[PDB]
Amino acid sequence: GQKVHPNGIRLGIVKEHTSVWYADRKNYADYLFADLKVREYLQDKLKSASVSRIDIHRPAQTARITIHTARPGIVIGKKGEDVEKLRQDLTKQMGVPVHINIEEIRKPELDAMLVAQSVAQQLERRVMFRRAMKRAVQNAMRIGAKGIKIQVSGRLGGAEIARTEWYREGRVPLHTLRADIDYATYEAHTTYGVIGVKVWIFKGEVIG
Amino acid sequence: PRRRVAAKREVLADPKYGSQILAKFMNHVMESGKKAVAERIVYGALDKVKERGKADPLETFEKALDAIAPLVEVKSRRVGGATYQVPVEVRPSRRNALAMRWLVDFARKRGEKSMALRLAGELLDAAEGKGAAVKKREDVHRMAEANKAFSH
Amino acid sequence: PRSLKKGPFIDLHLLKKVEVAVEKNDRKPIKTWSRRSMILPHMVGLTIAVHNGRQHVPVLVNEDMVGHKLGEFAATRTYRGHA
Amino acid sequence: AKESMKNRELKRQLTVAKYAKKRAELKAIIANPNSSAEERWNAQVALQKQPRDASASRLRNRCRLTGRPHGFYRKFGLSRNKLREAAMRGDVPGLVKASW
Amino acid sequence: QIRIRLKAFDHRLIDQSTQEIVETAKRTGAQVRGPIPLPTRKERFTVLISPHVNKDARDQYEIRTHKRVLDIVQPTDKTVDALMKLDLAAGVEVQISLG
Amino acid sequence: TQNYGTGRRKTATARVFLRPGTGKISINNRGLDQFFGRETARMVVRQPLELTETVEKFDIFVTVVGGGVSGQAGAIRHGITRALIEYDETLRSSLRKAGYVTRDAREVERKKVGLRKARKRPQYSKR
RNA sequence: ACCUUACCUGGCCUUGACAUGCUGAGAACUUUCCAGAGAUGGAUUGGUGCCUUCGGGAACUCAGACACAGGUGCUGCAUGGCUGUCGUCAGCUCGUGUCGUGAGAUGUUGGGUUAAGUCCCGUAACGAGCGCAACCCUUGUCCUUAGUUACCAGCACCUCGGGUGGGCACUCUAAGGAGACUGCCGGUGACAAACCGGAGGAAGGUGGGGAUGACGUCAAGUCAUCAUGGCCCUUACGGCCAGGGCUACACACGUGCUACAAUGGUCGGUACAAAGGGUUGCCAAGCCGCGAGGUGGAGCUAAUCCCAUAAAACCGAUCGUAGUCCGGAUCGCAGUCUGCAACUCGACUGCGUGAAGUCGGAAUCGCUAGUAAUCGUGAAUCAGAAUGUCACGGUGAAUACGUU
Ligand SMILES: [Mg+2]
Ligand SMILES: [Mg+2]
Ligand SMILES: [Mg+2]
Ligand SMILES: [Mg+2]
Ligand SMILES: [Mg+2]
Ligand SMILES: [Mg+2]
Ligand SMILES: [Mg+2]
Ligand SMILES: [Mg+2]
Ligand SMILES: [Mg+2]
Ligand SMILES: [Mg+2]
Ligand SMILES: [Mg+2]
Ligand SMILES: [Mg+2]
Ligand SMILES: [Mg+2]
Ligand SMILES: [Mg+2]
Ligand SMILES: [Mg+2]
Ligand SMILES: [Mg+2]
Ligand SMILES: [Mg+2]
């Protein structure tokens, strides 16, 4: 059958919301619209950079954005001629002033979004999918990662019939609420259609 | 049920008379959760019984149920090609349930002004046995001798 | 129906095309599309061609249709019969 | 959810919002008991002057990302099948799955 | 005699904010009663999950709103008027009344 | 002096105060029968009091919130039981045998998706 | 109802309602008029703008030109994502070892036991993973902190309204904890797993309900929410506007509401809920209407004001089983309200008319305890429109010997 989204079911329990603020009956819809627009725009623009988590906070009539990226050099170039243009543009979109903090993340191969994006862009370049799956799983398991599963669905190769493959290693218990299962999905556009990539990563148990 | 772990709840909430069968008859006559309606209807019926009947109405009640309870009951079992019936002794607990259900369902079918005096009428009729509930009881009883052949 | 706070309701260009019309007697049907408009006793005898969906059906107004709207005298669904 | 249709409902939004005052004044004068039949009738004429594409009844609210005419939740601004997608990612603040 | 009303979505932030403001007020020389909790508003939504016809397949979501009340007896130091940026940080709304 | 008890049953909450007296019985400053109109509620309230032959030994002042008449009657019974045991702490075994101190945990079951009632379902034609 | 809208009739446009790239003219705005069902076309006082390398430039409106833009057009049997179903059933697999020429098999069979591939014991198998269980939410007991707008045990005042002063007793509200673990006793049991009892305890045997849906199956559903490989039209399968239809009607089927009455229908006063929504909003008091409503403007960003009077239930009076003091369909006349507009085609109100229906064939359905049955209340969508969906409480049963 179908499986509930592992991030959503764990909201509040072990995961955290990506937009933390408060609003009322009037400004709530506007704030959600601004958040969705800013997130899609930021992802589309800094596609080249490996951006994973866009955290939004809203103090009184202000806004703060923090970016989790594996490559901070591109955004922080020669002492700040990039993030400032971004601040100005976001203030053009967001009526309130903005605030940017580029957060660098270590171990990119332990982040589900980055692994999914790398696998998808590899499949876009006509690379065999099994090799990509094996390389991603091995890279993840060299460090930590008490379990990882990768699934790819579509017209693999160029066959005119779709199928699903997946490779797992370690343990990935999706029915345990303590476990913080990082999860990601992405789409790779090829000449023969769309290929869907899903990544589950198991870090460990949260006790007490 | 295959498991047979389903225990039974015990109900005993007689308001003034402090009896047992009375409350179960209350539940039998209660419809759609109208417990107070059942209270007043059955108590008016019992008042009519008490004014008509010289003695107390509870022993008249139990005597009436004594003449409606079927001793044996017939139950169809298919031998695998023919539709038979088999007479069996009724479970001792089941006798009171059949008595109450039959008496209520027969008091329901009189057609006079209300069912309080209907219940009184069949309570006095069943007190010796000139009613219709006793008619059905004796019919079901005689079906057993009509089918005594199988029995085992 | 429409509350007594508002007596009539007529398309304004229809009102101008009827009020100007009465300067001379009934000589030509007036083409109308707004089925919603009320009709008073002041266009009695005039023939109005009301739009029906594919044609303008002409109807001659009399004094005995003051309380009925323009569309009631024009049928939009045919139903010639099952057989 | 054709983009022309989104454009022609957004333009309806502007047309409704851009008057925003003549409707109120005219209808208040009409609903005022003591204003004389002349100010009833001229107000009716005035209401019938302006284009029909000005009322709030003509305005059908739509999803701000897809414009799906059905399945709307006005507490948010999203449709039926984007609210869930955004919620499972945690974008909507203070939204979880309920059991009680 | 001022009163402070706190709105939040999750109790984790509101409890921390109430503890911080109570400790600051008691440390600065004010007199403070006991933090009063109000009934939490629960907004219920039920939404179809299938993109096409499956009426019995629902998803139920809930929004919780937590309300807290505090009072200041003997207002002697308005230091809390220099600490809004710290008292409220990300998702707690603070109202002050009867200044 | 006096003693106190609280009885909860079927979303009905009742507070009972027990003092010396003979059993005047006040329901929100109202007569007992003026409150319980033609029902066994009076008898079910008097059950635990009369089980210990102390109907005339005490006076009772109670208040009730929430629920229906049967729920409030059960709440009164439970509350006066908890108040009485606070006075004569040797009859706990008797009430345990009578099963009066034990609260009724039954509560209305919520409605679920795809069902009319909490457990009723549509007819399901198979063709 | 218009819109929604994707269909029909008719009218009206061609780089276009929308994006980028070239050229020219200039502000948007406000222009209070005319023709036109309307898109549209023609007058229309007013201002010539912002910043200036003072040269110029950004934005906005219109005209032309191509590359284009556009499609709810087809293919779910080319796809992603999402969903149903077997089924919340207890199963589905892998590494190493061993057996067989091999497909394969053992593990995972067997004796018990459990809701469970749960557990114990044996045992060429030894271990592991996804499932089961547990961690999450809620409900039932108690404790700590908390006392306004919530509460009122004591004290006093009281105009007898926690109304007032006042208190931190209580209920309650919401955070953190304790508690239930076959824990103790008896018997059975291969002196194992476990079962059957007992005490205590608010709760006893996963306490009650929820969320949680393994490997896969049905080329299952969706190209019309979205995205996307192909194919297709470009004066049209692309756009705009008026009306009409989706609410049609010799019939058939599914899911519902109301009844066929006396455990009822009317009349009078009468007691007790939970949950929730409200500053483009709720809309009180008063006054005028039999009536749906209208004026009015209070209080409220709300445990503070409003929606808002629960109903079935209980007491007294009447009807007397009659197609009726049942039942309300249908219809005639006159009205209220939102809406530009209630004919097609809205919801309610007043008077009058008053049908079928006497408990329903073959056949067929739901339900095991706050369950069925029955009674009312609220929210979403929404200007208006619920017998539908989701949600909350009141009263409250019968039955289960048994597995052919
Ligand atoms: Mg599109
Ligand atoms: Mg609308
Ligand atoms: Mg509940
Ligand atoms: Mg119910
Ligand atoms: Mg059927
Ligand atoms: Mg398919
Ligand atoms: Mg598919
Ligand atoms: Mg071999
Ligand atoms: Mg095998
Ligand atoms: Mg097997
Ligand atoms: Mg297992
Ligand atoms: Mg589980
Ligand atoms: Mg026991
Ligand atoms: Mg198919
Ligand atoms: Mg149209
Ligand atoms: Mg239709
Ligand atoms: Mg009648």
DSSP string for residues in A26-88 = THHHHHHHHHHHHHHHHHHHTTTTTEEEEEEE--TT--EEEEEES-HHHHS-TTTSSHHHHHH
Q: How far is the CA of C5 from the C1' of G8 (A)?
A: 37
Resolution (A): 2.7
> Is B142 (CB) below 7 Å from strand G?
no
Q: Chain D contact for E9, CB < 8 A?
A: yes
DSSP 8-state class, residue B90: P
- Report how far residue C14's alpha carbon sits from residue C37's, in angstroms, rounded to the nearest whole number: 8
CA pair distance A114, A130, nearest whole angstrom: 18
* CA E43/CA E65 separation, integer angstroms: 8
- First-to-last C-alpha distance (Å) of chain D: 37
Neighboring chain D residues of A28 at a CB cutoff of 8 Å: 75-76
Considering all nucleic acid strands, name the nucleotide whose C1' atom is nearest to the C-alpha of residue F113: G390
For residue E55, the chain F residue with the least C-alpha distance is F114
Q: Compute the distance between CA of residue E24 and CA of residue E20 in angstroms, rounded to an integer.
A: 6
What kind and span of H or E run contains A169?
Answer: strand A163-170
**By the 8 A CB rule, do A113 and A121 touch?**
no
Specify burial of residue A65 (Cβ count, 10 A radius: 0-12, 13-18, 19+). Answer: buried
The backbone torsions φ and ψ at residue F74, rounded to the nearest 5 degrees and listed phi first, read: -65, -40
Taking alpha carbons only, the member of F108, F112, F54 closest to residue F83 is F54
Can you give the three-state secondary structure of chain E, one letter per residue? CEEEEEEECCHHHHHHHHHHHHHHHHHCCCEECCCEEEEEEEEEEEEECCCCCCCCCEEEEEEEEEEEEEEEECCCCCHHHHCHHHHCCCCEEEEEECC
- For residue A27, which residues of chain E lie inside 8 Å, CB to CB? none
| Neighbouring C-beta atoms of residue E23, cutoff 10 Å | 11
Q: β-strands C47-51, C56-60: how paired? A: antiparallel
A71 CA vs G283 C1’ separation (Å): 58
* Cα C11 to Cα B152: distance, rounded to the nearest angstrom: 94
> Are D48 and C12 inside 8 Å of each other by CB?
yes
A180 burial type by CB count under 10 A (0-12 exposed, 13-18 middle, 19+ buried)? middle
Phi, psi of A75 (to 5 degrees): -75, -35
Cα distance between residue A53 and residue C40, in whole Å: 70
Task: Give E58's contacts in chain F (Cβ within 8 Å).
Answer: 113
* C-alpha to C-alpha distance for D70 and B81, rounded to whole angstroms: 60
Contact E91, E10 (CB under 8 A): yes
Estimate the crossing angle of helix A27-45 against helix A83-93, to 10 degrees: 150
Asked if A32 lies within 8 A of D89 by C-beta distance, the reply is: no
> At a CB cut-off of 8 Å and minimum separation 6, what does B142 contact?
none
Position of tokens 């190769």?
A157
> Is the alpha carbon torsion for C50, C55, C60, C63 positive or negative?
negative
CA neighbours within 13 Å on the CB side: how many for C3? Answer: 3
Contact with chain D for residue C5, Cβ under 8 A = yes
**Pairwise CB contact (< 8 Å): E46 & F114:** no
How many beta-carbon pairs under 8 angstroms link A with D? 56
Q: Cβ of C6 and D44 within 8 Å?
A: yes
